[PDB]
Each structure stands twice: as structure tokens, then as C-alpha cells.
Amino acid sequence: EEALRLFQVSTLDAALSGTLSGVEGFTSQEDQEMLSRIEKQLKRRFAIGSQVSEHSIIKDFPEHAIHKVLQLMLRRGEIQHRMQRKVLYRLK
Amino acid sequence: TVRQLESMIRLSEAMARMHCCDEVQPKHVKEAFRLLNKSIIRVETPFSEYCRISNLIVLHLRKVEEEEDESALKRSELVNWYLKEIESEIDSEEELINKKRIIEKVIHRLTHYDHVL
Amino acid sequence: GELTDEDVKMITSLSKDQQIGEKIFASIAPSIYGHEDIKRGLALALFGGEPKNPGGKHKVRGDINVLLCGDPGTAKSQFLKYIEKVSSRAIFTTGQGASAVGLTAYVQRHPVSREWTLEAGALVLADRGVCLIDEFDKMNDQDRTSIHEAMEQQSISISKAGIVTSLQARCTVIAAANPIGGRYDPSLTFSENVDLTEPIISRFDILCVVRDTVDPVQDEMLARFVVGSHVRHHPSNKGVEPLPQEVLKKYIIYAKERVHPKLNQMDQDKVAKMYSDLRKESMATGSIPITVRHIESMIRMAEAHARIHLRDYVIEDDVNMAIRVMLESFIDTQKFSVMRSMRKTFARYLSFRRDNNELLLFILKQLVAEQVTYQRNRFGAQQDTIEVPEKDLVDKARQINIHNLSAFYDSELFRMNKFSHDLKRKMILQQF
Ligand SMILES: Nc1ncnc2c1ncn2[C@@H]1O[C@H](COP(=O)(O)OP(=O)(O)OP(=O)(O)O)[C@@H](O)[C@H]1O
Ligand SMILES: [Mg+2]
């Protein structure tokens, strides 16, 4: 049993990697398209989905498990996940 | 770099040695600088380069400047304000459409990005 | 070369200076103009931290390893040459093949003595000294493996002829590298404009990004410096800081007063909170994340700073200065956007012992350079009598909470940089 638990903490990247990849990828794929559908309006009257985005999934539905995906997006930065927070933290 | 400075003083000493002088006169320094400066050739590249970038730098500079004092960042209001700002002492129709194209090309792969100069 | 007999009382005497730290920072590489931060980091490296091994199963070095990565002609080779002069047990080696001693161990018949000798490499010949590696970016695969093993495990493992041994190399590694492409790109991270892998870059406590930019004032100052050097060493006839330089002889002796070890029992909530804040920022921003090794290097630099003052206890100022150095190294190695953001949010940590005059001078240089770029972009060239209003300088000085610019205008440093205050129209301007 102890050996199987030690091995379970390595099935936790055999398998669990895909499971939490799916959990974080729910938010990843939702943020992937809607943050560029409005991208003609990402420079228009409203800059970008600023802080309501975390609250956007709150109403229609986890801050801890969504801020992590937000930082993963913010890690690289090319067009939308960069220019979101380029004007966000400036404009709060 | 500073190696250019050492080369310049080496060339000036060499000019003085050619004339069998005992002091490096400023004429020797002038010749060393002239030789060194002609030796550096320019990188000419194709498209009104050195003029597209000539005003692209001032454009990025103005946007960077207004980034601090104001938090108002749009696409239309800012593009028009930048047009007017550059045209603060100049005006034409083809020039305005030229600046419109330059913004178009620049935004294609940087939308006021976070790069340096 | 060293005796330190009866000479210790004057060492303690100038240790009592309470400004000995700046004197020592000012007394290294006297032949190199500027580069004050590299000088401070090299002084810390020379004194070094405290090696420890809790039990016998957790080994932390006390060596402070410095990596100078800067675009060419910026005195990095000169820095390494100076360090070789000032230290005992310093051996200079190069990433190319242009040196007496190479990084890797080998066994061979010696060319001149004809004796079968184990040529233990440069890393182990400096076992309690300094390994200076120029052209660090130009090493072989096997030189890179040797440096990785020495920097990681602090010993070299030979298994070459019939010799199986692990002879050890506890050196401080000071390296000079050129950036990829011959010019540092501030829009990239440190790791991606230097030809080094992360395992190597992570082994350096201080990463100094040397940066050749055209500043007319510093260009004049450096040109005067080097031309004066060329004048005074003409074979016929055979320096700017608040503090007097210290002669390299008593300085070598002072550094050789590492006979006294050192120890720390000081603050932990400030440091822990600082690392927590650094983590939150560096993982909010998509940046190189601060790690444990950064606080361990900060501890090394605090111990070194305490050793510079002969203290035998880290004091809050040692910790604060180590924080400033660790953060300067960690912040300059980010891409430009992240570098600006971290310069802002951590500025209170980052300006320790950084007086108002130099902060204000930095702001003023920034505005005047902004203005010069604006001028020359559509005026063909920069103009004469480049000027800037009183007001915007006042505004930025408030942004960092100065509010009292009068001493800045009266400063020696203001005058030295070819600046002038024109109170008639609230203008300040440069000559060139
Ligand atoms: N403060 C200074 N900054 C830059 N260069 C200086 C300074 N003081 C002196 N120099 C001169 O600059 C020259 C540059 O040589 P050095 O070998 O130090 O550059 P380097 O950094 O090794 O360049 P590279 O990366 O091309 O090897 C030296 O001959 C030195 O005399
Ligand atoms: Mg060199």
C-alpha cells in the first residue's frame, strides 16, 4: 500500500497532469476565443475585459484556480494577453 | 566604441610620426578622425527607410510620453491626435494618408508594444 | 606576499571609518572609469560570504560568482585583469584557447618538464581563490561541463588515465561574456541574449548587464580619462568619487583579513516578506521568477558586506545593501517591460543608500535623453543647448518624494555633468 501511494504521487503526472490540464484548459479555451472576438473593440470605448473576467465566470457558473490560468496566459504576451494587462494594471 | 578612441589616437600619433613631428597637432587629430569617419559606411536598406523610422521614433516617443500623464488609450482618438501632433506645423492630404498607412503597417505587428526605442 | 603583522591595527583603524564600504568600492579597478555597480559587486565577490554545511549533508557555498555580460569595449576584460592583479590565488583563463591554463583537467607529459603530470584545470588551481573566465560565452562543450561541475558541486571528477579522483575547486567564478549578436537587447531577458544555458546562469550571484549607450557627458568623461592615461604613460616620462581611493597595498592586506569568519542572527520577517512580495510580482508579471537561491545569494552578499566592515554580525544595513544588490541583479535581467515595472514597485528597496542627488541626476538624464531623441528624429541631429523645464523635473521628483531640488542644483554632481540651472525662466540645460 505504501509503495502504491508513492507510485500514485507519480501517476499524478502520468494521469493527473491531463486532468488538471483539462480543468485549467476549460478556462484557457474560454479565454482563448472571447478575448479576440472583441479584439476590434479591444482598442475601442472599453479597453479590455479588465477585472470582471474573473467575476464573469463567477456569476454564470474558483478565484484560486482561475488566477493561476490568468498568470499562465500573462506569462508570455503577444497580442491579447499582453495588451490586456498592459492597460489593466495601469487603469486598475 | 572606446576602441575607436584608441584607434583615433593611434592614427594621430602615426600622422605625427609621418611628418617627423614631436607633438600631435590637432591637424593630425583631424586627419585621423576624417579617415576613421569615412571608414564607417552606412547601412542603406530599401521604402523610405530612415524616414519611416525617423517619424516612427517620434511617434513611439509621444505615445510613451502620454502613457504616464494620462490613462486615456484608444485607437481612433489617439491615432487622430498623433496625426495632428505630428502635423503641428505641417499639413497635406497625401502626407496624412501616408501617416495613415505608416500606422497601419506598424500596428500590423506592434500595437504600441512594450519594446525599446 | 602577505604577512599581516602589526599591520592589523591600521586595518581596524580604517575599518572604523564608517564610510569604509564606499572607500573600498571606490578603490577597486582604479584604472576603469565609471561602472560603480560592477565595482561594488566585484568588491563583494572579493570578500565573499560564509560557506556552511549543516551537518555534513547540505552544502552551501560562500563564494559570490559574478557574470559580466555587456556589449563590447566596456572594460570587462580590464575588470578581470584587475581582479587577477589584486587577489592572491587568482588565475586568469579564457573561453577561447588563448590561455596558459584551461578549464578542464587532463593528464599528460608536461611539454617542458617532461614529467607525467595531472594537469588539474583552472578551476581547481584556484581552489580558494578566484577563477576569472573571459569570453565566457565561447567555451567548448567540455569547458561548459567542467564549469558546470565546478560551479555546482565545487569539485572536479577525473576518470581519465587510470586516475579516478575528485579533486576539489572552491573558487569564486568571475566571468565576462559578450551578448548574442554583439549588443545587449533590453527587450529580451538576460538568458536569451547571452549564449549560456540556464544551469550556468543560475550559478552566478551577481549578473551585471554592461550596456554601451551614447551619453555625451559620460563619453567626454571617459575620453578624457583614457586620453589622460595615454598622455601620462608616454615612454619619455617614465578618480572621481566622494571618497578617497585606498591604495592597493593596504587594500590587498585588508581583503586578506578574511582570517576572521563572520555570522548573522538578524531580521527574518522583513526578508521573508520581501521574498513573498517578489514572488507575487514576478509570478504576476510573466518574468523570471525569484527563487530561494536569490535569498541565499542575498545572504552571501550581506555576509560579504559585513566582512567589508569587519563587523562579525550582519547589521540591518548589511541586509539592506545586499537586498539592493540582489534586486539590482535580478531586476536588470528581465525584459524591458518587466524591468520598468519592478523598478517601480520595488523602488524603496532599490534606492537604499542611493542618495537624492544621484536619483535626481538619473531622472534628469532620462528626460534630457527623451528630449534629444525627440529633437534628432526630425531635426537630423541633436541641437545645441539642450534644455528641459523646471516643472517636469519637479513633478518626477515629487513622484519619488523629493520636493527639495535646491541641493540638487547646488550639487557638485549637477555641475560635473555639464548641467546648469537657469532660474530666470525655470530652465535647466546642458552644453553638449
Ligand atoms: N570605464 C571604461 N569603460 C570602457 N572602456 C574603458 C574604460 N576605461 C578604460 N577603457 C578602455 O576600453 C578598452 C576596452 O578593452 P576591454 O578588453 O576592457 O573591453 P572588453 O569589454 O573586453 O571588450 P570585448 O567584449 O570586445 O572583449 C580598454 O583598452 C580600456 O583601456
Ligand atoms: Mg574582452
What is the C-alpha separation between C30 and C24, in angstroms, rounded? 11
CB nearest to B5's CB, from C226, C337, C377: C226
Cβ(C75) to ligand 1 under 6 A?
A: yes
Q: Burial level of A10, CB count in 10 A (0-12/13-18/19+)? A: exposed
C91: its cell numbers? 588565475
C340/A contact by beta carbon, under 8 A: no
Q: Letter for the amino acid at C384?
A: D
DSSP type of residue C52? B
Give the Cα-Cα-Cα angle A68, A70, A72 (nearest 5 degrees).
Answer: 70
Strand partners for C67: C175, C207
Q: Are C28 and C316 within 8 A, CB to CB?
A: no
Cβ(C32) to ligand 1 under 6 A?
A: yes
Q: Are C45 and C66 within 8 A, CB to CB?
A: yes
What approach was used to elucidate this structure?
cryo-EM
Q: With CB atoms and an 8 Å threshold, state whether C283 touches A77.
A: no
Count CB neighbours of C70 within 10 A. Answer: 22
What is the number of CB-based contacts under 8 A between chain A and chain C?
10
Residues 6+ apart with CB under 8 A from B99: B55, B83, B86
C116: its cell numbers? 607525467
Q: How far apart are the first and last CA of chain C?
A: 48
- C149–chain A nearest CA distance, Å: 29
Q: With CB atoms and an 8 Å threshold, state whether B111 touches A43.
A: yes
CA of C78, closest atom in ligand 1: 18
Closest-CA residue, ligand 1 atom 10, reads C75
Chain B residues with at least one Cβ partner in C under 8 Å: 1-3, 5-6, 9, 54-55, 57-58, 61, 65, 114-117
What is the C-alpha separation between C374 and C370, in angstroms, rounded? 6
Render the burial of C326-339: b for 16+ CB within 10 Å, e for the rest: bbbbbbbbbbbbbb
What is the C-alpha separation between C158 and C179, in angstroms, rounded? 32
Cβ(C33) to ligand 1 under 6 A?
A: yes
Residues 6+ apart with CB under 8 A from C409: C421, C428
CA distances from A86 to A74, B73, B76, C345 (A): 10, 11, 18, 15
Residues of chain C contacting residue A76, judged by C-beta atoms under 8 Å apart: 286
B14/A contact by beta carbon, under 8 A: no
Q: Which ligand lies nearest to the CA atom of residue B7 in the structure?
A: 1
Residues of chain B contacting residue A45, judged by C-beta atoms under 8 Å apart: 74
Nearest to B31 by CA among B20, B18, B15: B15
The sheet carrying C419-422 orders its strands as C386-389, C427-430, C419-422
B74/A contact by beta carbon, under 8 A: yes
Count CB neighbours of C405 within 10 A. Answer: 20
Cβ(C221) to ligand 1 under 6 A?
A: no
> Cell 563619453 identifies what position?
C219
What is the C-alpha separation between C24 and C309, in angstroms, rounded? 10
Chains with ≥3 CB–CB distances under 8 Å to A: B, C
Give the Cα-Cα-Cα angle A78, A80, A84 (nearest 5 degrees).
Answer: 115
Q: With CB atoms and an 8 Å threshold, state whether B71 touches A91.
A: yes
Residues of chain A contacting residue B111, judged by C-beta atoms under 8 Å apart: 43, 79, 83
Distance A81 CA to ligand 2 centre (A): 40
Distance C267 CA to ligand 1 centre (A): 40
Q: Are C49 and C62 within 8 A, CB to CB?
A: yes
Give the Cα-Cα-Cα angle C167, C168, C169 (nearest 5 degrees).
Answer: 135
E strand or H helix that includes residue C369: helix C356-378
Cβ(C202) to ligand 1 under 6 A?
A: no
Q: Which ligand lies nearest to the CA atom of residue C31 in the structure?
A: 1
C262: its cell numbers? 563572520
What is the C-alpha separation between C183 and C72, in angstroms, rounded? 8
- B113–chain C nearest CA distance, Å: 10
